[PDB]
C-alpha cells in the first residue's frame, strides 16, 4: 500500500515558473517551447516494490519503472542521461536526478485532490498541479 494514494491517472491543470526552471536545467529553447505547451498526463501505478511513473503529452511519452531507494539510469524528455534514484520521504516521492556534476530535485506530493509537482534546479522551483483525470 506503498504510494495508494498516487496510484491513478493525473491531468496537468497549472504550471508556474516551469521555462525558468527548464532554462536552469539547460534545456534549449525549441524543447522548452514545445515541452512548455504540453498538457502532460501522468499515469502511476504499482505492482509489488515496482513503481511505473508514466508521463503522456503531444511532446513525448515517457516511462520509468523503479524501486525505491535503488538506482536507475533515465533518458529524459529533454534527452538527458541522468542517474536517479527515487525515494519516499514523509509520504513524499522525492526524485533526484543526478548527470555532468549537476543534480535537480521533482517532487510529488498529495495535497487535498491534487498531485503536486515541485521541480528544483538549484535556486529556481517550479509548481506543477495535476487532478485526477
Ligand atoms: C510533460 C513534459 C514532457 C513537459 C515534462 C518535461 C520535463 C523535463 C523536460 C524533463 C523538465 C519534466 O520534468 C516534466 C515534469 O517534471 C512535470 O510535469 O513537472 C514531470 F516529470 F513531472 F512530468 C514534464
Redesign the pocket.
Known amino acids: 500500500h506503498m504510494c495508494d494514494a498516487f496510484v491513478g491517472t493525473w491531468k496537468?491543470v497549472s504550471?508556474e515558473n516551469?521555462d525558468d526552471?527548464?532554462k536552469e536545467?539547460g534545456?534549449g529553447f525549441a524543447?522548452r517551447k514545445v515541452?512548455?505547451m504540453?498538457k502532460?498526463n501522468?499515469i502511476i501505478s504499482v505492482n509489488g516494490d515496482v513503481i511505473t511513473?508514466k508521463?503522456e503529452?503531444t511532446?513525448?511519452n515517457?516511462e520509468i519503472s523503479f524501486i525505491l531507494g535503488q538506482e536507475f539510469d533515465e533518458v529524459?524528455?529533454?534527452d538527458?542521461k541522468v542517474k536517479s534514484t527515487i525515494t519516499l520521504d514523509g509520504g513524499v516521492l522525492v526524485?533526484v536526478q543526478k548527470w555532468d556534476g549537476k543534480s535537480?530535485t521533482?517532487k510529488?506530493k498529495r495535497e487535498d485532490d491534487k498531485l503536486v509537482?515541485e521541480?528544483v534546479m538549484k535556486g529556481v522551483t517550479?509548481t506543477?498541479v495535476?487532478e485526477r483525470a
Open positions: 496537468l504550471s516551469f526552471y527548464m536545467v534545456v524543447t515541452a512548455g504540453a502532460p501522468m511513473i508521463s503529452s511532446f513525448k515517457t529524459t524528455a529533454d538527458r526524485h535537480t521533482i510529488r509537482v521541480c517550479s506543477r495535476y
